[PDB]
Write a protein that binds this DNA or RNA. Structure first.
Ligand SMILES: [Mn+2]
Length: 440
RNA sequence: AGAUC
């Protein structure tokens, strides 16, 4: 557990705190109050807007500069503590700007494998190792450890069973015979839609959660009755339910780079241990309501090296300026997930600004932005969106999607580099069509 | 699938 000793330079502390143990509502305030007392320049790193909003609740009234729109408080101007999301921190490290020389970095959910979180751990741990700063990483599953069954406030009954992943008409009576409340993690929105329809058909009350619907739908879990929450991994962090069962497919979709050539949303494939621990961690939280059960349908992923986020983290970190041209390393327990030589992705000055602008203003995925920038293409030149090979054609409703270009021509979306994330769902395609049209 | 400005 935490002690003020850990606030000295050259100390990186990983607080292994199991789900429900108090990372956000107990330990984080404790750390922040001591940093405020001792006037340490501190940044708090939340993985998501949601967790940031949860953080402000727990830090209510303390002098914290919230560098996120997810929170709106009056700032005194004397605030020495900043709060932002992992991706915001990493993006700002990429700008030609003045990053404060924070003495203390506090990262909550330090297992997050978003490429910007991985890159932030690399930068932060390198700065600690150089003697410049102190850092505290909090998670239930410290990087480098593979325990899918961490401790809990109340004992959890874990049972491996065949978990249905499609609509069913028989053979799974235990799903619907249950009279409690179930949180069911599914690999995708479309997959949860089919299961939710099947459960609704059988007379259950279902709330569905995803990135696209979380805002409006999650509050319903607080105020309406419900039998099932069917959720994507949106609910792995910063989401809590009054449930007594989790059903876990133990699968996910994850971006994968095929042959160095393109990015697909591979799967469904096994989740990591960290993600299984988070999913299981939705229950077993209430010592007054024992009896919770975790029903899971397969193993966890033994190697995450196929995940594109590892290489994308190195693309960010190779281009984050440290000191007179040094390059930060990935956080050591995770450094073996990428086999690329040191500095392989460092871009020269001009191509680097393009990569940065492609990601921030352009909102392209890291891997894609890097392909464009490293080809010498300028930010506003969108011709590559239309001149790929035929197998790069983006479909809409099984018909080649089309775009009115800045030159008043209707062209089929066929990007020179295919990254499935630009058209994996409706909002993504819409954002990329605007990009291909020259609108941002 | 997720993520930020
Ligand atoms: Mn927490």
């Amino acid at each position: 557990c935490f002690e003020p000793s850990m606030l000295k330079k050259k100390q990186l502390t990983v607080l292994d705190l199991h789900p429900g143990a108090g990372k956000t509502r107990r330990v984080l305030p404790e750390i922040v109050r001591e940093a405020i007392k001792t006037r340490l320049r501190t940044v708090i790193l939340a993985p998501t807007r949601v967790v940031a909003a949860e953080m402000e609740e727990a830090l209510r009234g303390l002098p914290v500069r919230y560098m996120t729109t997810a929170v709106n408080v009056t700032h005194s101007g004397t605030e020495i503590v900043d709060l932002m999301c992992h991706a915001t921190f990493t993006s700002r490290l990429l700008q030609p700007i003045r990053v404060p020389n924070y003495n203390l970095y506090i990262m909550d959910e330090a297992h997050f494998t978003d490429p910007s979180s991985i890159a932030a751990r690399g930068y932060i741990s390198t700065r600690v190792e150089m003697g410049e700063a102190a850092a505290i990483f909090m998670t239930a599953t410290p990087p480098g450890t593979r325990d899918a069954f961490p401790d809990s406030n109340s004992p959890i009954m874990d049972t491996e069973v065949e978990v249905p992943e499609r609509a069913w008409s028989s053979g799974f009576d235990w799903v619907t015979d249950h009279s409690g409340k179930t949180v069911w993690f599914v690999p995708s929105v479309r997959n949860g839609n089919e299961i939710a329809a099947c459960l609704t058909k059988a007379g259950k009350r279902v709330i569905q959660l995803s990135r696209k619907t979380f805002e409006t739908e999650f509050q319903k879990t607080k105020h309406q009755e419900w039998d099932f929450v069917v959720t994507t991994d949106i609910s792995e962090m910063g989401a809590n339910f009054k449930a007594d069962r989790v059903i876990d497919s133990r699968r996910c979709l994850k971006p994968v780079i095929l042959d160095g050539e393109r990015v697909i949303l591979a799967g469904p494939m096994p989740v990591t241990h960290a993600s299984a621990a988070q999913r299981r961690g939705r229950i077993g939280r209430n010592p007054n309501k024992p009896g919770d059960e975790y029903l899971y349908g397969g193993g966890c992923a033994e190697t995450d090296e196929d995940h594109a986020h590892w290489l994308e983290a190195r693309m960010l970190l190779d281009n984050i300026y440290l000191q007179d041209g040094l390059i930060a390393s990935l956080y050591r327990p995770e450094a073996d997930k990428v086999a690329a030589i040191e500095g392989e992705f460092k871009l020269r000055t001009e191509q680097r600004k393009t990569f940065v602008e492609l990601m921030k203003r352009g909102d392209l995925p890291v891997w894609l932005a890097y392909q464009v920038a490293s080809a010498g293409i300028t930010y506003t030149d969108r011709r590559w969106c239309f001149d790929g090979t035929t197998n790069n054609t983006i479909m809409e409703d099984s018909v080649p999607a089309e775009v009115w270009t800045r030159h008043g021509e209707k062209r089929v979306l066929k990007p020179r580099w295919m990254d499935a994330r630009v058209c994996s769902d409706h909002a993504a395609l819409k954002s990329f069509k605007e990009f291909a049209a020259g609108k941002r």
